[PDB]
Amino acid sequence: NGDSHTHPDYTAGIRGITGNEVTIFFAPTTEARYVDVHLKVNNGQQLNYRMTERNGEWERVVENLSSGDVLEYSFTYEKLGPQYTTEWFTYSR
C-alpha cells in the first residue's frame, strides 16, 4: 500500500503504513545536511517539520490518519549547499 515518487535527487513517499501511523520518507541520492517536510491533512493548516535522519534517509511519522484522510506533503532539501523545494504530493489513507 505505500507510494513512491522519484526525481534524480530523491525517492520520497509513504511507507510503514499501520492502523495508527504512516511514515513520510525522503531518500536523497546525494547526502543532505537537512530535509524539512511541509504537510497538510484534508487541506488543513500547513505544518512544517525537520525530518529525522536515519542511515542516509529522512523520516517523519504522521500519526492517527483515519481511513479517507488526505495527506499532502512537500519537501525542502539541502544538496551541496543550497536548498530546493518540491511540489506537493498526495496520499489517501
Q: Using CB under 5 A, list all residues that contact Br ion.
A: 4, 6, 30-31, 49-50, 87-88
Q: Which is nearer to Br ion, 33 or 50 (CB)?
A: 50
Beta bridge partners of 72: 40, 90
**Amino acid code (one letter) for 50:** R
Among 5, 38, 11, 6, CA closest to 26: 11
Among 31, 37, 27, CA closest to 5: 27
Q: Cell triple for residue 19?
A: 492502523
Provide, rounded to whole angstroms, the least separation between the CB of residue 36 and Br ion: 8
Q: Which is nearer to Br ion, 38 or 93 (CB)?
A: 38
Provide, rounded to whole angstroms, the least separation between the CB of residue 5 and Br ion: 6
Provide, rounded to whole angstroms, the least separation between the CB of residue 66 and Br ion: 24
